[PDB]
Design a protein around this ligand. Structure first.
Ligand code: FMN
Ligand code: CJH
Ligand code: ORO
Length: 361
């Protein structure tokens, strides 16, 4: 598992032979079969959300939408895996092409539109390995399940409620994905009144599950929120005792300077141009919640430095996806090795010490 070989040869060859969606599909297949190319220091261990995480580097939602490659992802070195988004009924998502690479920007634009095998299919897939997962979780390798809603659903809150009922018993944490830019009306669920009503329902459903089957609940937010939007979210999160936030989803913005020919495709932008917009959103959300609400930081993480910036901004854990599509599997060990070195260099005893450190200087 050599970084240079993957970065300069394997990935560019793969990217030259297949369209992005096909490459994604082959990636999932290959990962699930456990054919793949770092020993985690105690310094990387984090305890949050009612769990031990052996390292703070997770695979973000969208790579394994249907829960097919969970074990292969742990083998890749991820400290935690998040699957989804999963919708109640199966649905196909948007017409193809719907994923686009911007290699000059180390970015991706996607408009998948919640292509999902649906709750029932994912439920059975997770049930087939439920005890294996119980042991992985106990070993410090938790599982997150990200919930979406169907395109034609009338009642968004009932879609999330159904997700809580069906996959909640199989998850260490649930994500109420209220931030996809690719489902009409979805991001409006981030508004105060809508959000309070939605999350009240979600939390009631979650609280009705048996103790050993009772997941933490997080809300995943956009990087495109107004100051007022962020204030309102922070307020609702604290009012309801939401367990954490995932910050951030993809951006509908197109930062000045994008070079990719495909920069004006519709969809969510991910990877390097998102990085600091995401970090700044983490920083604001951490301040508005007084450091009391765990944050999973996501967006543009490709290095130890990227990870530590999000951690010092207030993230307890980080995730990546887009970097894997450029650098391949060696990126996971790279991020971890670099993060470990930076923690030592900056005088932190471990990840935990660094969480929110920028707010204390
Ligand atoms: C192809 C693609 C599909 C995604 N699908 C989902 C999704 O289903 N649900 C979700 O919450 N986030 C989804 N995301 C967003 C990622 O989870 C993450 O928030 C975002 O891509 C920023 O991280 P990154 O720059 O490391 O990719 C997707 C991202 C991409 C690249
Ligand atoms: C020889 C195998 O190397 C691997 C092993 C496991 C995964 C990967 C790999 C992971 C993700 C991707 N994904 C993409 O390239 C992509 C795009 N565009 C998306 C949307 O996932 C491709 C390859 C490559
Ligand atoms: O399915 C998608 O289109 C999608 C969902 C999401 O939450 N974020 C994203 O970038 N794409």
């Amino acid at each position: 598992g050599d970084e240079r070989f993957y970065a300069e040869h394997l990935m560019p060859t793969l990217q030259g032979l297949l369209d992005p969606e096909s490459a994604h599909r082959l990636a999932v297949r290959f990962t699930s079969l456990g054919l793949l190319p770092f020993q985690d220091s105690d310094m990387l261990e984090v305890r949050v959300l009612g769990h031990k995480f052996r390292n703070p580097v997770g695979i973000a939602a969208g790579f394994d939408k249907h829960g097919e490659a969970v074990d292969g992802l742990y083998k890749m070195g991820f400290g935690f895996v998040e699957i989804g988004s999963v919708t109640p009924k199966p649905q196909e998502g948007n017409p193809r092409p719907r994923v686009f690479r911007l290699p000059e920007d180390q970015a991706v634009i996607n408009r998948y539109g919640f292509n999902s095998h649906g709750l029932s299919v994912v439920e059975h897939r997770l049930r087939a390995r439920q005890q294996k997962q119980a042991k992985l979780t106990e070993d410090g390798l938790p599982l997150g399940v990200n919930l979406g809603k169907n395109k034609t659903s009338v009642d968004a809150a009932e879609d999330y409620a159904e997700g809580v009922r069906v996959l909640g018993p199989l998850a260490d944490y649930l994500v109420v994905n209220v931030s996809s830019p690719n489902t009409a009306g979805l991001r409006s669920l981030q508004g105060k009144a809508e959000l309070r009503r939605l999350l009240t329902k979600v939390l009631q459903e979650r609280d009705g599950l048996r103790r050993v089957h009772r997941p933490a609940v997080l809300v995943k937010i956009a990087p495109d929120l107004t100051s007022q939007d962020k204030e309102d979210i922070a307020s609702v999160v604290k009012e309801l005792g939401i367990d954490g936030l995932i910050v951030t989803n993809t951006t509908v913005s197109r930062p000045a300077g994008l070079q990719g020919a495909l920069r004006s495709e519709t969809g969510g932008l991910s990877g390097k141009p998102l990085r600091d917009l995401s970090t700044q959103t983490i920083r604001e959300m951490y301040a508005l919640t007084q450091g009391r609400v765990p944050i999973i930081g996501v967006g543009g993480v490709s290095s130890g430095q990227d990870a530590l910036e999000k951690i010092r901004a207030g993230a307890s854990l980080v995730q990546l996806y887009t970097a894997l599509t450029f650098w391949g599997p060696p990126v996971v060990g790279k991020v971890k090795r670099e993060l470990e070195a930076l923690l030592k260099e900056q005088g932190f005893g471990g990840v935990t010490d660094a969480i929110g450190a920028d707010h204390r200087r």
